[model samples]
Target: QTKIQKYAGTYMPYPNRTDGMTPFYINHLGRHGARFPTSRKALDKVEKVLVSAQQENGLTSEGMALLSMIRRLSRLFDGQWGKLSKLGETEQEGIAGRMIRNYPQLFSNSAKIEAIATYVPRSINSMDAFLSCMIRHNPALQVQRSEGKQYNHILRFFDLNKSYVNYKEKGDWLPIYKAFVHKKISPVPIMKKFLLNPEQYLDKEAEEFVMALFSVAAILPDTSIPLNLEDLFTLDEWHRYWQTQNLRQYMSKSSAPVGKMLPVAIAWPLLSEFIRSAQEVISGKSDYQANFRFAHAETVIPFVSLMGIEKTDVQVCRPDSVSVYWKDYEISPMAANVQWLFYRDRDQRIWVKILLNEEAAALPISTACFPYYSWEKTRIFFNQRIEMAKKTLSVFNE
Candidate 1:
């Protein structure tokens, strides 16, 4: 259950698309795969908690085993937390292989593909892993790789909203989240059953202790290696942890309440790049067949909302309303991605379709073509949203 990050255990694949559309270009945006921790911050904290528990003889046998596992994992990641593991490389390769298998002609002897990534090590490794598979599959494939300061506005975007930067100072959406965690993050009762002297661990300390364990459990999937623990979290405990993780993902990256109009504040730059890239292909100004971008969870989450692909697109009016539509595991698991496959006929008319995490996805934009959207219709739909997104973004500007 742990290995491979539950690639899509609960995934929904929206089926059906207009058939017989020949492809001319493709655009893809993907989160990096199965990376080590962004830093030692997490596992380091784990060690601190487990060690504290041990000194008091407060941990159960299972807890002791869990400590060793956490320590071992920490050692594995000590000097290299943010780097991509071998499993991450394999993950990207597999995704690339699937892309080639689904659209055989997309990577042709003459096709030119442009690939780019943020300066982050994992993103660059992902770019390398994906393209290496493409080239291996089609030996004659041509690719131009790009990165650097100029690309940051699109691939490595930094949010411009000053208030959002200090969102906590505004008490923005804190009550909703604090409430959620208060309800969902109950580890003390379990810790009492888990430890000989539960009194040694206060509720807050117990909460942090269990949270560290939960995070490690959540992280095990990316390693794609088997992990053993003496004490398994109960179903309710795991679900509780999942909600907190989703909430952490939601408020940090989403356009949730309080910002009211700024949900896509962090997302517009990349959205602009997607529309502009398609226009270049349609205008006959660019001959590139694919524009592939590799980034992080933060990059994809806001875009998912802005793309109107999820429930949190506009505003999460009520705090409790988040999980109804946005689930972190579904949106940005180990190898999460959204791809736009563009098809064209000799007549220069283009039809577009989408795939989210390798499954057919229907765009929220209504089009006459069923699953395939007219290039013009697609542009019109996204254009209106983009302007609105910018208008909201202006409120945060100087």
Candidate 2:
């Protein structure tokens, strides 16, 4: 069975706030929920390899079973590349419903809600699903939705940043990642299970074939298929497969030194928006009661790390220790999100609490009361971070 589980509903009710503190606004960023494999590359690779094996009469019973499943999965994925599955829609709806239930006071008044998403269909669809549920529960809610490349500088900043791109493709981590793959991507053992003559295939081709198989197997829950491919991977193999992927994300998406400054630095625009909107709400200069951003794992990972939230902000020098420091499933599961819940005391003093994946999460800023920091202090803390990131970005641009 897969180690990854679906996103359960919200945990225990949010922490009790200090006296007179009431939630007035929310700032949210979420990854799109589960979907088919992002592209057909995996499916196609598996099919081609299996077909070749079948022609040579090199297929074992397990190999034939895998080929049958690939054919069916490909049929189901027709014209559905990168689109959210039925499960994803429900996941978004669940998150929205819980938002209203947990913070009922925020929905009592009729106020405009602003939602923006990346240009991708899955993200935009997730936004629709979430907003649809919110409005269905509260018909009086006024909603404005938008999606365009104009917002990409913040919602999809990683691709736009040249230095970050350079670091991702040609970074110091490239050699490390390649070495890790060479050591860990042993497909021969599994290929032996499927091939009558494993020596017939090249090691690189075997690696590609097995990786494609694993990729499809990992996404079983995201689709409507009724197959069980989990048993194909022994526990040791499964853990190895997951580690390679986890380390790649850690190096490319986190504060790890290989691409340290660029990973967090590129998230400044998104963080700045959070700060700007919260400041606007506090100063009574903003009209919207809540703001939501729908993006991808690329967006959520860096933003959370940049916020310096406990666990999500982890960094380590050793690739082997990557899993010890951070896990992809824990940091960014399907429909993962970070919420900044803004509260105000009756005396006009403001406090903000951060939530990573719907539970109260800790920030690095010091506060007399845990989970609740003075807005003034929080702003200064993040502004300093933003300035540091800005300097890093400029160094790249010049």
Candidate 3:
């Protein structure tokens, strides 16, 4: 006989302090339920049907059509495949491919279709053939084309329908059902069928299947990790802090100060560094928290500089000179222009004018140590320098 050990640990019923507690519970009433299991099951079944369809067709035409539909729908809706509710077996088969072909005006230039189509095997001949045939014949694609709406609208409708169905079935239907129906027709029957017989139609064993389908639709090349809090915020601590503080409030308050105080000279460099470092962490080349600290340093250093603090102490530095020039004007000529103009006379008497002339202009001269300027400039410069130094030192040591 084999002995099994039961796990022993305190299972606190109350929400953990780290997890945070809300005075009032938020009800995502109209939100779609997690259907990863259903999606996976659906995918597996679809794959089998697709394979059978291909065999019957004597080509991967059906498979290609299905792949194309998935790709088009995903791209249009931003990587949400499960949101589709009314897709019949035929409609679901080749909708993506059909959309690409029928609406050459819309998807004509989209590399996403080609990219997504590449993930599908060439036995269907390629994306081009699938697009050509499916678009010519698929009813769903034809309907979308005749509607003359962007692909996004179709995807949104699908998502809305799926969400509406989920809310209706959980016995939590109320104001949300009315709200959803107000936007479209009532889809009560669709919801009932999907929820009650999910096992019959979906692949329940496939983990993160919906997410994977979303990635495919969105044309995201990487599928190893699904989007989550960690993807959005580099640091777990920062994510937790934001959740505790209420992200909406924090964003609303933070944006005003950030916009008002942004140092034009340093903003680009700082933002660039921040984005690069963040990408590196997201791609798993570096530790997320460490990269976040580095990026945060860059953003905060400029503000620190405005206080007349030493760079070493504040961990940020100001540029030797903060001057505005011409290419900047070409970039956003309508909004503002900061130009250095030199007027030369026949007598060789030269005068310089700092042109701060635009829709919103006061003077071309850069403010000195203004709180906002200092904060923005110091934060950006220091963060960038710190990251650069770290990389350089690491390389040298190696």
Candidate 4:
């Protein structure tokens, strides 16, 4: 399933570990939940076309309904693009509820914990929702935040990288992306539904505008706002749009036609922090028992690559490859997260297991113990990648 084919599923119960160990800490990284559009560009694109169409007396009954829906959304979202929605709030609460239940020993007596979020509205609010839920469960919880002075590397790097942004804006993928869009983006029936007559024809701009409306409907937070945007497009059209989105994500986020490790630079600081935390705990000096950072999908995609999560054989950039394993829907649905659960044995040996969206997941390295790997091995793997990245791009002072 493509990312967001629907809502992401809930956490599953992990099998008991073979080694009798106590789980003491968590290092959690996550994307913000369902959020508003990144900007008004697409909405304005639809508005401009619809306004012009209405002036020309081209809007039919369905067309008017479409326009009215846009108006409501525009006003409701006035100056609030990229902000978290009500569903987002609920998602964080639900994730937190699940986290506490799964690792009761870890959180039940938490003396203190670390909570950090990027300044972005959605990320901050998502952190707030999670922290609120955390504090609600334990009223006396002390949470330390990582936000002022220096750059908040964990959450801020993904958005700050110039190369990534340049790659996206360069539109080098436009040729392939355009071919895919034109080949599969069929919104005829929906457009015909909104036209004055069954045989009425729409200009290129008008048709694109109508499809832009479909895009808007697709991205809106699934809520009880009475915004039934499904009427704008068909099942086929929706899935096609999803594929297009997946393709874009692949080219931009994953190793594709060019620059395999281009985005991995942002992942270095977080990986360093991960190892540093483990070392601090080993030396018995760290106060925070758990760590959680709220960010976006921009962080997850490349981080997964650096962490060596399996990729699909099928690539949108390649046009001939397909990946059943590295599906974006599964990897980065809204509110998606990666958790590093740390366990200590009676001998004081530290081990870590990775969980993607609450399910046991593999790190870049394979282990006889399956998901669990010694903290020594984890540190080596992550630190090696950082060393290479440092040579390639001086991303960290370490």
TM-score of 3: 0.19
Sorted by TM-score (best first), the order is 2, 1, 4, 3
1-398 per-residue lDDT for model 1 (tens digits): 44223322221111112225457788899887777656666677767876887887777886687678778887766777677778788878888887787778767667889998887878888899999999888878878997655667776554445655566344466666666777778776666655677656666666776776666665655554566432357666766666666766677667666656454565778988898988897788888889999987767777777777635464666666666767766677766788888887577677878777776666676777666788777777777778877877677673
lDDT of candidate 3 over 43-159, digit per residue (tens): 444344434444554223333655455444334444443221211112222333333343344333212111111111221122233334444543333211111123112112212
Tell me the whole-model lDDT of each prediction, alpha carbons only.
Answer: 0.70, 0.81, 0.25, 0.67
* TM-score of candidate 2 on Cα atoms, chains taken together: 0.92
Model 1 weakest 10-residue run by lDDT? 7-16
Among these predictions, the greatest TM-score belongs to 2
lDDT per residue, candidate 2, 75-121, as tens digits? 88888888888878888888888888888779766977999999999
C-alpha lDDT of residue 79 in model 3:
46
For candidate 2, list the clashing residue pairs, or say none: none
Cα RMSD to the true fold for all candidates: 3.7, 4.0, 24.9, 4.7
**Model 1 lDDT vs. the true structure?**
0.70
Highest lDDT: which candidate?
A: 2
Q: Residue by residue across 1-398, what tens digits does model 4's lDDT show?
A: 33334422111111122215447888888888777777677788877766776888877887787788788888977877777878778888888888877776677664578887776778888888999999999877778876431545655665666766676677466566666666666656666666554234544554476557766776664332556565466566665666666666766666555444555555777777777876786687886778888887877776766676545212333532423334566677778888888888778777888887787876667677877888888788888877776664553232
User: TM-scores, in order shown?
Assistant: 0.89, 0.92, 0.19, 0.85
lDDT of 2 at 191: 91
Number of colliding residue pairs in model 3: 27
Ranking by lDDT: 2, 1, 4, 3
